[PDB]
Structures are given as structure tokens and as C-alpha cells.
Amino acid sequence: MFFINILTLLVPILIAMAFLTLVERKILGYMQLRKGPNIVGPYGILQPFADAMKLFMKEPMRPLTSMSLFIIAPTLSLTLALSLWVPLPMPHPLINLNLGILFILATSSLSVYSILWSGWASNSKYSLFGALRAVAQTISYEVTMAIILLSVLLMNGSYSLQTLITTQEHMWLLLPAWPMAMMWFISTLAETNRAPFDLTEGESELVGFNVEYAAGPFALFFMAEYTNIILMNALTTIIFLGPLYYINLPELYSTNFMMEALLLSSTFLWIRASYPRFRYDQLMHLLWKNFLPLTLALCMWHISLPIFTAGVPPYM
Amino acid sequence: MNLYTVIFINILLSLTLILVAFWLPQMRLPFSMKFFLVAITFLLFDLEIALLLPLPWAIQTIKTSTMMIMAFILVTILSLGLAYEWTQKGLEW
Amino acid sequence: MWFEILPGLAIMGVCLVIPGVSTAYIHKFTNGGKEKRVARVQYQWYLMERDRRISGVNRYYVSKGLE
Amino acid sequence: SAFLKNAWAKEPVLVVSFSVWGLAIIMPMISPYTKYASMINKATPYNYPVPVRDDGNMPDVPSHPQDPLGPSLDWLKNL
Amino acid sequence: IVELPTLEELKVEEVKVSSAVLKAAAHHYGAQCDKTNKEFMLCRWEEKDPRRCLKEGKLVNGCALNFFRQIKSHCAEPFTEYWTCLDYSNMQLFRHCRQQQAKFDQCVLDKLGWVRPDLGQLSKVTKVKTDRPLPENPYHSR
Amino acid sequence: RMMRWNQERRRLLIEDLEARIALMPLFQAEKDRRTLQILRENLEEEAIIMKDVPNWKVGESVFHTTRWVPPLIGEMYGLRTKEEMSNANFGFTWYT
């Protein structure tokens, strides 16, 4: 069985990963007064499969570059992103890990390399400049991203994502800790290099590791980004928006997980069309000046709220 | 093992895709201390996180007073590090 | 109108519930209709193992007062 | 004070930031529950409570732990 | 040599019931049978030597066994319903099953006369006096 | 609400920890009883494995002291089935 449970939890996500690009190229469209892709297939459903086939067929030109730090980089990007769905606790998880959130934080951190490796591998100026800035904001955002989680955990009692289903049986962790949700949401927008924070794929700025990447390598990161886009949104939908859990019927948890994840996934699509991209330093100015002092202080408030409100969370 | 099974499928799925990519279509001095400085700060903060990471287990510590007294001191002294980062052109790219 | 972005979403949603319902029924099948025991701490693994020894080889089989 | 005001309206994060830093440095000191944390966590029984030999003249609950003697967590109950 | 005890010396009836069964009756067993339990435990630690408190251990299983025989005889059905619901949960959490727990608890209070021990009052240290003289030179220090 | 919920959750946690507190005595006996059996069983095979070996005390504490010393995992399952040993060794790190 366990193998079947690996197909499910993977394929299903990959098929959904494909349908996100479509729901991105249509929701951005209607917002901009245009139908979006509906001519290939019925209502554009076959559109994601179509360019996948075009991308894999086109030549994966190997620049006149490393040949490993070039092929390791997309493999690592897809491997880490699809891997981080392993411990996610939809209803009950596939591989329940006692230190689950540390797994998610650590696996995310490893993806910054793929950007570093791809940028060095390309051996063209646009790629290296883009990678150095890209690596900078990713790890810069990781620092507040991690502290925001530590505040959460201390009110959950453990690192296991499964505990929050029991922590959020009466109220979402948004009500409490909303100030961090926002700061988790903005950090989730940075770590998936989506729009407000997307200077990496900044086109007007550095047309950038993906610059020399075409066809199959382009696709793998590509796939990775979008799967992440979902995963991080899904982590928002478990950690802060806690879907109702009934032990008797486990799927209403997954049904609402489905609904909240899609809406917050819809939100970063909506954010992209709505906002201009921030400047490189304007981006780091936010995290180190605007958010890190807020996060570190609210981190202390979350070590104090438990103690003097005699609410220290139950381990286990 | 269960994790090992999942992960190797994960690498296999990705290695399969890159290969398909290559096999199917048969038919110099960019330096700014700011960037280095950030990386450094990053670890000083990352190492700090590592010190804060045990706080979920330490909450249940019988002492409590010492726990918070310790944790508050750590967060405050690093934040002051940040504060001086501000005074310095550091954090000002 | 906007009616049309729904087709695509439907196929995303349906592909994000499968996983949660699937993992949560391939567990209740392999473990004998009883949720897979989560052994966070050793005690639990001990109790679980003890169960194995108590009957058959699998812990899910559960002997009762009538034993 | 005046800067404080503008600070509340310009750079209004740090203000909030510091404010919290302090409020977390005060509430613990002054609160009707702070003491409970060290108790509620102290009480939680994780390791087996080994029984002592009854040499005699002891207030330790003998026999059934239900004996009225000993520690109680009614403070935890109805907390 | 090692003076490892013989099998016949360590063969005694076994409880062998699913851990779930125990967790459901745990509270009551902590109640009806700690007099002997404790004793075995007190010998267990003062002795610092499993090899030297097995006679007491056989008493442990036994006391519990009848504990079970009583429940099997009386209010078996309630207990059966309570354990089955308790077992379904993955961490066999007590709060998912409170309706079944109430009927099981009320009945044995009604028939056996036992009582579910109130929150606590099991964690508190117990005093049990045992003949086994206080171990001498535990740790066998020269 | 968070303050009240965790206070309740704490009450449930103390309740089930105490539930094992009560049940461990039954397990402690069980463990020891079984542990010794494994040691002894290994003795039998021990008394049949190196019999031919000259100067072979069937068995002797690696130590000098003669006090009971808990057996290491290897000792208990070393001679036994590989799987048995593996289970114990890598059987928790690998979840149920």
C-alpha cells in the first residue's frame, strides 16, 4: 500500500501543480479584461500539458558552463519542493515526523542553493548578479520566516505539524497571532519569489538564474516553484488557518484544507497582478527594518503570553 | 525507511524528468561587502535561532523564571546587535 | 465571464483532496480499521510493540478481556 | 513626547516593536497566573513516582493514592 | 558465571491484553492494585537489581489478572464498548471517548464499588512498607 | 481562549501520564521477566556454542563487580535473528 500512498500525494499534487499555472493565466486574465487561454482543449484544461510537451522537446542547450551544477540545480529544486509535501499533515500525514516543522524549515532552506548553483553554472553576468541578490533575500527572509514559526510552536507545544490540528480545535491561530500571519504571508510571498517580491525573475531588472535555462531544466524549477507556491500556502492553511477537524470524518479537514489552500493560493496570484515589484534594497529594508524588529519582539511576547497567562502548552 | 522510500521516488521523479529533457529533443568580479555582510549577519541570526530552537522543550522546564530570563536576554542582546547594525552603514546597503 | 476559471480550479481542488483522503484511508486499511498508531515517544512504541507480541505479529489485531 | 508622536506616525513599527518588547517584560512580573506555570508544568507527572519505605510516622499517602493526604492539583482543576 | 534465573522461575500467567485495553482501565488498575504494584516497584528500585524482585513481579501480574476477572464478570459490556472506541483513535486519546467512559465508570462504581481516581491522586508518592530488608550496600561497593 | 484551551489540554496530559504511571508497574515486571528470558535463552545457546573452545568459561561478566548490570541491546538480540536486532536498533527511528 505505502507505495500507492506515494503516488497519491505526488501525482495528485503534480496534476494540481499543472492546473495552478492555468488558474494563474486565467485569473490574471479576467483581472486584466481578457479571457486567458481557452482555445486549446475545453476552457484551456489541456493548456498546461501542451507547453510541458513543447518545453521538453525543445533543445536543452548546454552553454559553451558547468554540466552538473547545471543539472543538479533543477533536480534539487523539484526534489526538495515535492519532498516537503511528504510530512504535510492533511488529515493524517504520510510520514509523521515528531520534529516536522524543522523538516519543512530545513528543506526550504536547501532550495537557496539551487539558485546559487544555477547562477554560478550559467557563467554569464546576468545569472551571477541575479543569483547573489536572490540568495540574499531568500536567506534574509528565512531569518524572520524561522522566528515567526518559533513563536507559533511555543503556543503549540511541539514541532510536529500534527499537534496543531489539536491546538486549533476551538479557534484558528490567526485570531491569536494574526500579526504574524500577515508576516508569514508576506514571507511566504518572498520565499516563493512571487510578485511583490520577485526581483529574481525580475525581467526589467536582470531579464535571473533561469536565463540560461530552457526546455527541461526550465521546467523542473518551474514545476518546483509552483508546487512550492502551493506548499507554503498549504502551511499557512495548517499553521494559521486551522481547517475544522472531526475525528469521525477525516475528509472535511481535507475539504476545508482544499478550500483555504486554493483561496490563499488564489491570493498570491491576485497579489502579483495587483502590485509593482519592490526594489532589491527596498525588499531587504522591509525584512531587516520593518519586520525583524516586529518579529523578534512578538517572539518574546509569545514566550511571555504562555507563562503569565498560565497557558504553557502541553508537550505531546 | 518509509521516508527513504518516499525520498528516492522523489529524486527518481526529478532525475527522470531531466533525462527526458536531454534525451527527448534528439529530433567575474561581482562583489559588494553588503552581500557578504548580509550572509554573515544571516548566520549570526541563524546561530541565534539555533539557540532559540530548544525553547518549545524549555517551556516545560520547572524553572520558568530562568527560562524566560535567559530567553529574553538572548533576544534583547541580538536585537541590540541589529540595532548597531543600523547605526553602522550596515543594513543600509 | 469569470465562470471559466472554475474548470481549471476544479481539477486543482480535486487533486488536492485526493491526497488527504487517500493518505487517510490507506492508513485505515493497512492498520485494520484503526488509525495508525502514532508513536511519538518510546512508551508508545513499546505499547505498540507489546501489542504485536500479544497477538499474530501485527499490532492492529487487538485482543480483549476475552483472553 | 513630540517625537514619540511622530514616531507613532512615522516609523510606526519600531514603536510597536519596542512596546511589545516591554509589555512582555512586564506582564510576567505582574500577573495572577505567572506562578502557575512553574507549578502546572511541575505537576505534570512524566516519570514514575517511586514509593518510599514506611518506616513510620509519615504523612505520605499510604496505600491507595486516593488517600486524602499528599499533594493536590485542585488548583489545576478549576484553574 | 551470570546466575541468570531459570525459565521455570520466571514463568507466570500473562495479562496479554491490547495496550488499549489497559489504557482504558489504567486509572482503575492504578486504583484497585497499587498496594502490590507499589511493593514490586519499591523492591525494584531499592534493590537496583531486577534479578532480585521477581517474586513480587509475579504477584503483580496476578493481582491485575483478577482485577480483569472481576471486570470481565461485571460490567464487561461497558468496558468492551469503552476500549473499542478508545482503540480506534491513533494516540488512543481519552477525550474522544467520554460518553463510553461515563457508562463504564458509573457501572463499576455501582457494582464493583471501585472508583475512578479524580484528576491526580495517582501521581502522588505512596508509602508501602515491605519486609524485604532495606538493601545493604546497594551498588555492591567495595 | 488559547489560555483556557491549553490549561484544559494540560489537564488531559496529566490524566494520561498518570494512566501509564499506574500501568508501568505491570509492564516493568513484564519487561524484566522477558529481558531475563532473553539473557538466559542466549545462555543456553551460549552453553552450546563455544563448548568446544578451550579455556572457555561458558560466560563471565566482562566486568569484575558482580552486580546486576542492565544488558545492552546487542547482547539481548545479538545472537538472535538479524531482523530482531534491526527492529530494536532501527525500529523507532523508523515510525510505526
Side-chain angles (χ1 to χ4, degrees):
Chain A
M1 289 299 185
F2 179 75
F3 303 99
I4 293 74
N5 199 5
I6 300 183
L7 276 313
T8 66
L9 185 271
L10 284 194
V11 177
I13 303 301
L14 278 194
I15 286 321
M17 177 178 73
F19 280 101
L20 188 147
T21 59
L22 177 63
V23 175
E24 168 156 25
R25 295 176 64 186
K26 297 183 71 68
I27 272 176
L28 295 174
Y30 281 97
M31 293 177 182
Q32 295 138 6
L33 275 66
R34 65 182 181 88
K35 298 183 71 68
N38 64 34
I39 186 167
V40 62
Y43 303 115
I45 60 171
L46 295 174
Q47 183 65 260
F49 306 112
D51 65 9
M53 292 177 72
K54 183 180 68 65
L55 275 173
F56 296 160
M57 291 177 182
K58 291 189 292 185
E59 184 178 2
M61 181 171 174
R62 319 151 297 238
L64 278 66
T65 177
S66 171
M67 179 67 181
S68 192
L69 283 70
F70 193 100
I71 62 100
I72 280 153
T75 59
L76 177 63
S77 295
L78 177 63
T79 296
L80 300 155
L82 295 174
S83 296
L84 291 137
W85 271 89
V86 172
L88 223 57
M90 295 149 293
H92 61 319
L94 176 65
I95 297 182
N96 63 34
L97 285 184
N98 289 337
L99 289 194
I101 293 169
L102 295 174
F103 170 99
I104 303 301
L105 295 174
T107 316
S108 301
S109 307
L110 287 194
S111 64
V112 63
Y113 283 104
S114 64
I115 315 177
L116 177 63
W117 291 341
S118 59
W120 188 84
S122 291
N123 290 131
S124 64
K125 202 179 305 298
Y126 267 95
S127 296
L128 203 49
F129 191 40
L132 295 174
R133 305 182 327 175
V135 63
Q137 64 180 20
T138 318
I139 61 171
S140 298
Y141 267 99
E142 183 65 13
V143 182
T144 188
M145 184 176 282
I147 294 169
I148 278 155
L149 261 188
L150 177 63
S151 296
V152 173
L153 303 143
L154 292 169
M155 76 185 60
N156 166 43
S158 168
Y159 275 99
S160 179
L161 282 70
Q162 189 178 4
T163 58
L164 289 83
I165 297 166
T166 60
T167 301
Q168 272 150 311
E169 183 178 2
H170 297 165
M171 67 174 282
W172 289 358
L173 269 204
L174 177 63
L175 310 184
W178 65 255
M180 293 177 182
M182 297 187 184
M183 277 196 305
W184 172 254
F185 181 75
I186 303 301
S187 295
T188 64
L189 276 169
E191 196 98 1
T192 54
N193 287 339
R194 295 286 293 172
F197 316 92
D198 200 356
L199 61 80
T200 63
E201 217 259 352
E203 197 64 25
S204 61
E205 300 86 6
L206 297 183
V207 303
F209 54 100
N210 296 315
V211 161
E212 286 267 4
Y213 271 64
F218 177 76
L220 275 66
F221 292 136
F222 200 84
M223 293 165 49
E225 181 183 6
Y226 284 71
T227 299
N228 274 352
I229 301 169
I230 310 181
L231 177 63
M232 303 294 188
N233 275 301
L235 278 148
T236 300
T237 301
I238 304 301
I239 300 159
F240 287 102
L241 276 66
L244 62 80
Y245 183 63
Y246 289 128
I247 61 171
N248 64 34
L249 63 80
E251 71 281 5
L252 295 174
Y253 185 105
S254 64
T255 311
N256 288 284
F257 157 83
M258 177 178 73
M259 294 204 269
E260 292 177 350
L262 273 204
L263 295 174
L264 274 66
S265 280
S266 295
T267 315
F268 296 160
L269 275 66
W270 180 8
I271 296 326
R272 184 206 206 189
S274 297
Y275 296 144
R277 280 190 317 250
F278 272 89
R279 297 176 64 186
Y280 173 77
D281 64 9
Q282 190 178 162
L283 190 147
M284 292 177 72
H285 189 279
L286 188 147
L287 189 147
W288 290 95
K289 203 97 48 184
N290 297 132
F291 275 16
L292 177 63
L294 178 63
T295 309
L296 279 157
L298 295 174
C299 184
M300 295 177 72
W301 177 245
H302 284 135
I303 318 177
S304 179
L305 188 147
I307 310 317
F308 59 88
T309 59
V312 296
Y315 189 60
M316 318 177 185
Chain B
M1 189 61 184
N2 258 352
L3 177 63
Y4 272 119
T5 294
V6 162
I7 306 297
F8 295 161
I9 299 309
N10 303 347
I11 309 176
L12 289 184
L13 208 42
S14 320
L15 276 173
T16 288
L17 283 195
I18 283 298
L19 178 57
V20 172
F22 283 66
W23 175 91
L24 197 277
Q26 286 185 359
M27 69 193 88
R28 292 162 44 261
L29 188 48
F31 177 92
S32 56
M33 286 287 300
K34 54 179 181 179
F35 289 172
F36 177 73
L37 173 60
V38 171
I40 298 306
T41 57
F42 167 69
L43 294 174
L44 296 177
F45 271 67
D46 223 14
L47 292 167
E48 172 187 3
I49 293 175
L51 295 163
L52 295 174
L53 273 184
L55 275 197
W57 298 289
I59 287 296
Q60 280 74 358
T61 53
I62 302 121
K63 305 264 187 322
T64 73
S65 176
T66 81
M67 188 269 306
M68 61 175 213
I69 293 312
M70 202 63 185
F72 289 165
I73 285 314
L74 178 55
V75 157
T76 302
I77 65 162
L78 267 295
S79 294
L80 292 181
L82 177 66
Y84 177 75
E85 194 71 20
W86 294 40
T87 74
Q88 295 295 100
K89 178 72 191 308
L91 279 203
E92 315 173 20
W93 40 82
Chain C
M1 293 300 293
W2 53 261
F3 298 170
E4 304 177 350
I5 78 185
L6 304 191
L9 288 157
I11 323 185
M12 279 192 58
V14 165
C15 292
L16 293 181
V17 63
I18 293 171
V21 176
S22 69
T23 299
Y25 275 122
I26 311 177
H27 280 179
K28 293 184 175 71
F29 177 100
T30 58
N31 309 311
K34 291 187 300 301
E35 310 178 8
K36 181 168 64 183
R37 281 202 188 91
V38 185
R40 187 188 194 283
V41 296
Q42 309 250 9
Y43 178 70
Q44 301 174 347
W45 180 249
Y46 177 66
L47 263 55
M48 179 176 316
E49 290 291 49
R50 173 176 173 273
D51 297 353
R52 146 163 69 91
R53 302 179 190 87
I54 281 176
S55 301
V57 182
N58 312 351
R59 49 92 182 182
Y60 63 83
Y61 301 105
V62 283
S63 297
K64 55 188 176 306
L66 295 174
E67 192 165 303
Chain D
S1 173
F3 77 100
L4 179 63
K5 300 180 68 283
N6 64 45
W8 169 232
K10 66 162 181 50
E11 282 291 356
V13 198
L14 285 62
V15 174
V16 183
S17 176
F18 304 149
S19 171
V20 172
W21 177 94
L23 177 63
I25 217 69
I26 170 182
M27 297 301 301
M29 304 185 304
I30 171 179
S31 182
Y33 288 103
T34 301
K35 66 173 182 302
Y36 295 114
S38 181
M39 306 180 183
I40 183 179
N41 71 359
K42 183 191 307 179
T44 40
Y46 299 98
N47 51 358
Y48 189 84
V50 63
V52 297
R53 186 182 295 276
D54 191 7
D55 65 9
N57 289 337
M58 288 196 304
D60 303 357
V61 159
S63 65
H64 201 156
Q66 276 191 21
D67 290 21
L69 318 179
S72 65
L73 302 186
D74 300 351
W75 69 271
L76 168 81
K77 317 184 55 187
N78 57 83
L79 184 55
Chain E
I1 306 301
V2 78
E3 193 256 327
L4 283 173
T6 181
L7 292 78
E8 185 62 13
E9 170 180 355
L10 47 77
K11 187 193 65 59
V12 79
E13 185 179 338
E14 292 83 350
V15 175
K16 301 155 48 184
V17 82
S18 178
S19 69
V21 176
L22 312 181
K23 288 186 50 180
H27 291 292
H28 288 253
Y29 164 81
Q32 296 281 135
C33 302
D34 61 356
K35 199 50 186 179
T36 188
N37 279 13
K38 288 303 179 185
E39 298 164 3
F40 157 65
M41 295 300 293
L42 189 147
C43 184
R44 178 64 180 86
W45 293 32
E46 285 181 345
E47 273 282 9
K48 300 298 183 310
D49 176 13
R51 299 177 314 178
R52 293 182 183 174
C53 301
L54 295 174
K55 290 179 179 179
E56 295 302 320
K58 308 162 199 330
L59 315 178
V60 176
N61 304 23
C63 198
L65 299 162
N66 63 72
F67 172 80
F68 278 130
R69 235 166 273 114
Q70 313 183 43
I71 317 184
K72 177 183 308 183
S73 61
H74 328 292
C75 305
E77 182 50 59
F79 190 38
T80 300
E81 295 163 273
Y82 181 33
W83 78 255
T84 310
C85 82
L86 177 63
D87 209 9
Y88 170 66
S89 178
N90 63 34
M91 283 179 59
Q92 293 177 335
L93 295 174
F94 291 74
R95 65 182 181 88
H96 297 165
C97 291
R98 283 294 147 98
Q99 157 65 50
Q100 295 85 0
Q101 178 179 141
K103 297 183 71 68
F104 159 64
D105 277 358
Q106 193 50 65
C107 289
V108 294
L109 170 67
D110 293 340
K111 299 183 71 68
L112 295 174
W114 314 346
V115 185
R116 165 71 169 268
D118 188 20
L119 177 63
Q121 294 177 335
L122 275 66
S123 171
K124 63 180 68 180
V125 63
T126 303
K127 64 179 180 180
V128 295
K129 50 185 55 185
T130 176
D131 303 13
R132 316 201 47 163
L134 191 142
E136 172 181 353
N137 181 14
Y139 295 92
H140 272 226
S141 179
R142 63 194 189 95
Chain F
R1 167 145 309 181
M2 186 89 262
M3 177 178 73
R4 300 285 304 274
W5 177 221
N6 288 337
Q7 273 149 12
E8 165 55 29
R9 295 176 64 186
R10 296 286 293 172
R11 293 178 179 83
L12 303 160
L13 176 93
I14 294 169
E15 167 208 274
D16 65 9
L17 295 174
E18 293 177 350
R20 63 180 295 275
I21 306 301
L23 289 159
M24 183 175 171
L26 180 84
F27 300 145
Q28 175 64 197
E30 296 171 5
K31 176 175 54 181
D32 285 5
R33 183 179 300 98
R34 184 181 57 87
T35 301
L36 296 174
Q37 197 166 0
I38 306 184
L39 279 298
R40 183 75 157 178
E41 290 184 13
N42 298 338
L43 194 280
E44 157 196 355
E45 334 305 347
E46 184 173 10
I48 317 172
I49 294 169
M50 301 187 59
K51 54 186 309 175
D52 194 351
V53 174
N55 188 3
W56 171 244
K57 267 52 186 177
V58 170
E60 174 57 22
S61 63
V62 293
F63 320 109
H64 302 100
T65 58
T66 62
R67 152 203 47 190
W68 170 245
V69 171
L72 174 58
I73 291 186
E75 317 169 0
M76 289 184 300
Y77 304 92
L79 309 178
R80 294 183 181 277
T81 300
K82 173 178 180 180
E83 161 270 359
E84 288 186 13
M85 200 214 61
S86 177
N87 175 12
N89 197 9
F90 307 97
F92 189 68
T93 300
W94 302 342
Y95 72 110
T96 299

